[PDB]
């Protein structure tokens, strides 16, 4: 008989989806809440409470990204560690929780559930590339939260799909975003081995910026910062590419901090040589 | 003294366990009759 | 004319192929002569490094000679405990080669199998819930436990009815974590020394450390040659001392790679109260007797590798005998196969399962050789 | 009885096979195992297995005595001051 | 045409040189063959099994002298041809395999087979009919077509333990089974397996299992299984290690081996308490045939 109730509940979720488009927020949320109470014991066999997660995602839009609504999605998604029998979409739902934490803008808040993200693994190399398409979203989340060396570690993972796309700007940007990490990342044994591996790529060779980036990779004696500002005026606004320029001097929070880092890393280069 | 465990066609190559030493593939001595030597029979083998 | 000359050339080509075979025979003879020169090397184990120049070693037969390394012998890889080749006359190290049959060690290594089926006997209400939850959090993130500062719980105890959760679901956990497991029956661990049992367990723990996913399973921990020895004049509670030693090994000295030494065994008659304290045994999971509806599900899983007439009411067969044992339900299926073997029926009719269930009901009534009770 | 116990492991058991083999070669013979208690006439066979070598010697006598073709022409006379100590398998008839 | 005939004549001259090369190859082989014959004949040949096979093409041989030697060159015989745990002929001083040698087995194993065969009937056993039927399923059904088991997917268990008080006929069922069904019955006892030299008993068990593998219809009966299968001794240092090694050898054949049901083993013990839990294991000796003391109805029939 519980299975019969579940069959009725499966019909309810389809009706609730039609209701969500059919009626305004106040009636639809009440209907979703009423089914939610009945299926508190019931597992999310498909979208049984995944629809509730979509409903809170809808509430976030209704509440103009209210933090409490984002927290409501966070707690329910946190509850659904193994709630959904399907695996691929369940991992995607965990990513949806993470994006809301990034929306909080605490940076640490995304990292707090990034530990839950740490449990998620092998999105890349999954069959059909569907998980790889999802994998692009997970790496995309990493930015300020990832370390300057780490952003490159994710950007190289993002680079594979645009390289398959071979977009004139996006594929070039995908390689460019990984290469720009060296300017903002401090010298290390790991940094040197990584810069050599990225250097010499045929696609990278085409980009003019890669020629500018080679100066740090080689000892190159000393590169004056004032000369670099003339050389990297294009980086601020290429007008042809500039697609990964956000990674460097995008603006202030992720740009001016990068501007100071470039001066520091070249100053570090001057002392090392 | 040693104990025979088996015999082979053509050259007999009888293999004998000495009593603690090893399985020795020893051919029959020149002054012996092959029929007289028998499988599962105690035998005396000169070391030299 | 020209065609006849071509045929003669073909015969010459066949002769050339025979010449190539003769050359191969000459190459084989050259290899055999080269082989004859080598005189072999005594096989021995390095007891210790007396000095960089000389390492003390013992030949396998037993005489020990101090020996010196040869050319590029990689003395770093010549560390004591490595099998070595010793010159027959020179008696000096020639090469480092590690080959050990290790039959007892193999029992202590990866001998235990893992059951691929997620639900061989079903009954996964807490088996894929509480048992999975406690092990998964350290396995996924030991560092998160480190942020809390609590030592990740080393192990959990699956106290349960014998056979239903003991014979089966012992290796089902291995599929749940998707890795092969090490079975601590302890029969291999206790061989000729009561003291060595803890040391051999430490060796198994090191083997467990080698694979981070692999989880130590203390299945049948009480089981031993004859019967487990409790405190007594002839034999004392060596196993209880090993359990106290195990607690020391589990926390501090031997905890790494987020490997869980779960004591998931209902075999021990007595459970240490100190072990029950949070840490050594943070949580205990209780396997439960089947709900009969659950037994019907178990019978279906057991019926999966079965050819049947198709007119089978499994619920009626399950209702007919309340075996309450996953092994007993598996027995019902096997006995039904025996009934099918009678009369040469490849298919098994529902009656054959019911006849087997009646025989199993008699087996359920009479049981022997069970002396293991949790707590 | 003392001769059957030997320093080497199961060396005595080999002798018991020889005892039957000698008995088989002769036609109709009686073997007097006086002081059967000396010939491991008990089977506690505890975990220590101190008597393991003798216990193997006792079992070898039992199988050769009866089972898979027994004495055939051998009559066995065994004399014991304490019958209770004797192992149950030896006491079982057919063997005696 | 004529040029092709001239080319064939030049190849024929090369073939004449090749015949000389073949004689030279034979002569080099003959010298190695003469040494090989002398070494096998010589006393230090010490033919014994290879413990393991190694590659840099290498072999480790334990001679009957119980000394282990590693040979950088595997030997004159082909490396692929050589099998680990197979008899190989060690060199007199080089300790390098020269010949594999004919396969041979312990004389005791050959004696175990009941060539004469027993003379007993299933009918003669009285009051143990249910146990007789269980034994038939364990041994006769695998001996007969296994197709019925195969269609179901069930597999007949290999290894049967009969445990009973001394009077009950554990041997009586075994003797009758061997007489009623002819399948290379083999006699065995825990004492017979035990030998003075360490590992000699293990060889005896291994050879007996090999004899069972050799004959498609094969049954091995081990009475007094407790003697080999005593609770493993915890005596420290000096102990009856050899007997434990024999018990391990039987376990090695039983565990993860003999998946084919052609070979089945029946074992009997007056006391099942002495037997280690390992011998029964899970499937190593799953079959159990308890023999109850005769019931009143059984006693009237037995008398
Ligand atoms: N049901 C029976 N019918 C006939 N004879 C029987 C029966 N049960 C026992 N016996 C007698 O028992 C003897 C068979 O040897 P038995 O199997 O008892 O030896 P065992 O090695 O001591 O057995 P176990 O290993 O079971 O203790 C014979 O004397 C036989 O006549």
Swiss-Prot record, chain A:
GO terms for biological process: proteasome-mediated ubiquitin-dependent protein catabolic process. This is 26S proteasome non-ATPase regulatory subunit 12. Belongs to the proteasome subunit p55 family. Residues 150-273 form the PCI domain. Component of the 19S proteasome regulatory particle complex. The 26S proteasome consists of a 20S core particle (CP) and two 19S regulatory subunits (RP). The regulatory particle is made of a lid composed of 9 subunits including PSMD12, a base containing 6 ATPases and few additional components. Interacts with ERCC6. It comes from Homo sapiens (Human). Keywords: Acetylation, Intellectual disability, Isopeptide bond, Proteasome, Ubl conjugation. The modification N6-acetyllysine is found at residue 129. The gene is PSMD12. It is linked to Stankiewicz-Isidor syndrome: A neurodevelopmental disorder characterized by delayed psychomotor development, intellectual disability, behavioral disorders, mild dysmorphism, ophthalmologic anomalies, feeding difficulties, deafness, and variable congenital malformations of the cardiac and/or urogenital systems. GO terms for cellular component: cytoplasm; cytosol; extracellular exosome; extracellular region; ficolin-1-rich granule lumen; membrane; nucleoplasm; proteasome accessory complex.
From Swiss-Prot, chain C:
The modification N6-acetyllysine is found at residues 58, 192. CDD domains: RecA-like_PAN_like. The modification Phosphoserine is found at residue 230. One of its GO terms (cellular component) is extracellular exosome. Pfam families: AAA, AAA_lid_3, Prot_ATP_ID_OB_C. Keywords: Acetylation, ATP-binding, Cytoplasm, Nucleotide-binding, Nucleus, Phosphoprotein, Proteasome. InterPro entries: 26S_Proteasome_ATPase, AAA+_ATPase, AAA_lid_3, ATPase_AAA_core, ATPase_AAA_CS, NA-bd_OB-fold, P-loop_NTPase, Prot_ATP_ID_OB_2nd. It is found in: Cytoplasm; Nucleus. PROSITE patterns: AAA. GO terms for molecular function: ATP binding; ATP hydrolysis activity; identical protein binding; proteasome-activating activity; protein-macromolecule adaptor activity. It comes from the Eukaryota. The keyword Transferase does not apply. ATP binds at residues 160-167. GO terms for biological process: ERAD pathway; positive regulation of inclusion body assembly; positive regulation of proteasomal protein catabolic process; positive regulation of RNA polymerase II transcription preinitiation complex assembly; proteasome-mediated ubiquitin-dependent protein catabolic process. The keyword Cytoplasm applies. Component of the 26S proteasome, a multiprotein complex involved in the ATP-dependent degradation of ubiquitinated proteins. This complex plays a key role in the maintenance of protein homeostasis by removing misfolded or damaged proteins, which could impair cellular functions, and by removing proteins whose functions are no longer required. Therefore, the proteasome participates in numerous cellular processes, including cell cycle progression, apoptosis, or DNA damage repair.
Curated annotation (Swiss-Prot), chain D:
Component of the 26S proteasome, a multiprotein complex involved in the ATP-dependent degradation of ubiquitinated proteins. This complex plays a key role in the maintenance of protein homeostasis by removing misfolded or damaged proteins, which could impair cellular functions, and by removing proteins whose functions are no longer required. Therefore, the proteasome participates in numerous cellular processes, including cell cycle progression, apoptosis, or DNA damage repair. Belongs to the AAA ATPase family. The lineage of its organism: Eukaryota, Metazoa, Chordata, Craniata, Vertebrata. Monoubiquitinated by RNF181. Phosphorylated. Dephosphorylated by UBLCP1 which impairs PSMC2 ATPase activity and disrupts 26S proteasome assembly. Component of the 19S proteasome regulatory particle complex. The 26S proteasome consists of a 20S core particle (CP) and two 19S regulatory subunits (RP). The regulatory particle is made of a lid composed of 9 subunits, a base containing 6 ATPases including PSMC2 and few additional components. Interacts with NDC80/HEC; this interaction is detected only during M phase. Interacts and SQSTM1. Interacts with PAAF1. Directly interacts with TRIM5. (Microbial infection) Interacts with HIV-1 Tat. It is found in: Cytoplasm. This is 26S proteasome regulatory subunit 7. Signal peptide: none annotated.
From Swiss-Prot, chain E:
It comes from the Eukaryota. The keyword Acetylation applies. GO terms for molecular function: ATP binding; ATP hydrolysis activity; identical protein binding; proteasome-activating activity. Sumoylated by UBE2I in response to MEKK1-mediated stimuli. GO terms for cellular component: cytosol; extracellular region; ficolin-1-rich granule lumen; membrane; nucleoplasm; nucleus; P-body; proteasome accessory complex. One of its GO terms (biological process) is modulation by host of viral transcription. ATP binds at residues 164-171. Component of the 26S proteasome, a multiprotein complex involved in the ATP-dependent degradation of ubiquitinated proteins. This complex plays a key role in the maintenance of protein homeostasis by removing misfolded or damaged proteins, which could impair cellular functions, and by removing proteins whose functions are no longer required. Therefore, the proteasome participates in numerous cellular processes, including cell cycle progression, apoptosis, or DNA damage repair. Belongs to the AAA ATPase family. Component of the 19S proteasome regulatory particle complex. The 26S proteasome consists of a 20S core particle (CP) and two 19S regulatory subunits (RP). The regulatory particle is made of a lid composed of 9 subunits, a base containing 6 ATPases including PSMC3 and few additional components. Interacts with PAAF1. This is 26S proteasome regulatory subunit 6A. It comes from Homo sapiens. The gene is PSMC3. The chain holds residues 44 to 366 of 439 of the full protein.
């Amino acid at each position: 008989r519980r299975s019969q109730l579940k069959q009725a509940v499966a019909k309810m979720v389809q009706q609730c989806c039609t209701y969500v488009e059919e009626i305004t927020d106040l009636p639809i949320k009440l209907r979703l809440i009423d089914t939610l109470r009945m299926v508190t014991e019931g597992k999310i066999y498909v979208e049984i409470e995944r629809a509730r997660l979509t409903k809170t995602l809808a509430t976030i839009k209704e509440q103009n990204g209210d933090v409490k609504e984002a927290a409501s999605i966070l707690q329910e998604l946190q509850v659904e560690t193994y709630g959904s029998m399907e695996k691929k979409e369940r991992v995607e739902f965990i990513l949806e929780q993470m994006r809301l934490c990034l929306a909080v803008k605490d940076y640490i808040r995304t990292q707090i559930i990034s530990k839950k993200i740490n449990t998620k693994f092998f999105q890349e190399e999954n069959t059909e590339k569907l998980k790889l398409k999802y994998y692009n979203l997970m790496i995309q989340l990493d930015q300020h939260e990832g370390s300057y060396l780490s952003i490159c570690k994710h950007y190289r993972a993002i680079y594979d799909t645009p390289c398959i796309q071979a977009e004139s700007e996006k594929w070039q940007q995908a390689l460019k975003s990984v290469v720009l990490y060296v300017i903002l990342a401090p010298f290390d044994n790991e940094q040197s081995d990584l810069v050599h591996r990225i250097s010499g790529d045929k696609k990278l060779e085409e980009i003019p910026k890669y020629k500018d980036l080679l100066k740090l990779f080689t000892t190159m004696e000393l590169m004056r910062w004032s000369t670099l500002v003339e050389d990297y005026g294009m980086e601020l606004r290429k007008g042809s590419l500039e697609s990964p320029a956000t990674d460097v001097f995008g603006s202030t929070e992720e740009g001016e901090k990068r501007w100071k880092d470039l001066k520091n890393r070249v100053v570090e280069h001057n002392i090392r040589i | 003294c040693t104990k025979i465990i088996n015999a082979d066609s053509e050259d007999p190559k009888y293999i004998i366990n000495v009593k603690q030493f090893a399985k020795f593939v020893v051919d029959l001595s020149d002054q012996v009759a092959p029929t007289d030597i028998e499988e599962g029979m105690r035998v005396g083998v000169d070391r030299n | 004319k020209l065609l006849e000359h071509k045929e003669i050339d073909g015969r010459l080509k066949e002769l050339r192929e025979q010449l190539k075979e003769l050359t191969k025979q000459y190459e084989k003879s050259e290899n055999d002569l080269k082989a004859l020169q080598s005189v072999g090397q005594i096989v021995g184990e390095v007891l210790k490094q007396l000095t960089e120049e000389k390492f003390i070693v013992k030949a396998t037969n037993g005489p020990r000679y101090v020996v010196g390394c040869r050319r590029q012998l990689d003395k770093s890889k010549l560390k004591p405990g490595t099998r070595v080749a010793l010159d027959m006359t020179t008696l000096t190290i020639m090469r480092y080669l590690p080959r050990e049959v290790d039959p007892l060690v193999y029992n202590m290594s990866h001998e235990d199998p893992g059951n691929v089926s997620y639900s061989e006997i079903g009954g996964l209400s807490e088996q894929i819930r509480e048992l999975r939850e406690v092990i998964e959090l350290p396995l996924t993130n030991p560092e998160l436990f480190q942020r809390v500062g609590i030592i990740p719980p080393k192990g959990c105890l699956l106290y349960g009815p014998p056979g239903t959760g003991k014979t089966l679901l012992a290796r089902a956990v291995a599929s749940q974590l998707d890795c092969n497991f090490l079975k601590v029956v302890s029969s291999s661990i206790v061989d000729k020394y009561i003291g060595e049992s803890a040391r051999l367990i430490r060796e198994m723990f090191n083997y467990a450390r080698d694979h981070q996913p692999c989880i130590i399973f203390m299945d049948e921990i009480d089981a031993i040659g004859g019967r487990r020895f409790s405190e007594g004049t002839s034999a004392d509670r060596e196993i209880q001392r090993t359990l106290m030693e195990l607690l020391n090994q589990m926390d501090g000295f031997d905890t790494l790679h987020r490997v869980k030494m779960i004591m998931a065994t209902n075999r021990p008659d007595t459970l240490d109260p100190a072990l029950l304290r949070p840490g050594r045994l943070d949580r205990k999971i209780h396997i439960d007797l089947p709900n009969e509806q659950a037994r019907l599900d178990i019978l279906k899983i057991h019926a999966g590798p079965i050819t049947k007439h198709g007119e089978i009411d499994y619920e009626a067969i399950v209702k007919l005998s309340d075996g309450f044992n996953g092994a007993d339900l598996r027995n019902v299926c096997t006995e039904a196969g025996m009934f099918a073997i009678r009369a040469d029926h490849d298919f098994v009719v529902q009656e054959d399962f019911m006849k087997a269930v009646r025989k199993v009901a008699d087996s359920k009534k009479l049981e022997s050789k069970l002396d293991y009770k949790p707590v | 009885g003392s001769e059957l116990v030997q320093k080497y492991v199961g060396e005595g058991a080999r002798m018991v096979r020889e005892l039957f083999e000698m008995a088989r070669t002769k036609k109709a013979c009686l073997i007097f195992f006086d002081e059967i208690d000396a010939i491991g006439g008990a089977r506690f066979d505890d975990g220590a297995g101190g008597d393991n070598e003798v216990q193997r010697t006792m079992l070898e006598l039992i199988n050769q005595l009866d089972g898979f073709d027994p004495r055939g022409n051998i009559k066995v006379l065994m004399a014991t001051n304490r019958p209770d100590t004797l192992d149950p398998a030896l006491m079982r008839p057919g063997r005696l | 045409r004529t040029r092709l005939l001239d080319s064939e004549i030049k190849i024929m001259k090369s073939e004449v040189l090749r015949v000389t090369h073949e004689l030279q190859a034979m002569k080099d082989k003959i010298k190695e063959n003469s040494e090989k014959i002398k070494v096998n004949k010589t006393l230090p040949y010490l033919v014994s099994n290879v413990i393991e096979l190694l590659d840099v093409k290498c072999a480790v041989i334990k001679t009957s002298t119980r000394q282990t030697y590693f040979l950088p060159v595997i030997g004159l015989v082909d490396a692929e041809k050589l099998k680990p745990g197979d008899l190989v002929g060690v060199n007199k001083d080089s300790y390098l395999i020269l010949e594999t040698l004919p396969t041979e087995y312990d004389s005791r194993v050959k004696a175990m087979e009941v060539d004469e065969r027993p003379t007993e009937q299933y009918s003669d056993i009285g009051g143990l009919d249910k146990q007789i039927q269980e034994l038939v399923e364990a041994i006769v059904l695998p001996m007969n077509h296994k197709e019925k088991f195969e269609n179901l997917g069930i597999q007949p268990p290999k290894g049967v333990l009969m445990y009973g008080p001394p009077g009950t006929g554990k041997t009586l069922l075994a003797r009758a089974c061997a007489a009623q069904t002819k399948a290379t019955f083999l006699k065995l006892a825990g004492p017979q397996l035990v030998q003075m030299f360490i590992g000699d008993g293990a060889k005896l068990v291994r050879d007996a299992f090999a004899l069972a593998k050799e004959k498609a219809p094969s049954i091995i009966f081990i009475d007094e299984l407790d003697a080999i299968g005593t609770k493993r001794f915890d005596s420290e240092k000096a102990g009856d290690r050899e007997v434990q090694r024999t018990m391990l050898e039987l376990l090695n054949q039983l565990d993860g081996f003999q998946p084919n049901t052609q070979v089945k083993v029946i074992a009997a013990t007056n006391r099942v308490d002495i037997l280690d839990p390992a011998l029964l294991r899970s499937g190593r000796l799953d079959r159990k045939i308890e023999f109850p003391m005769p019931n009143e109805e059984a006693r009237a029939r037995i008398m």
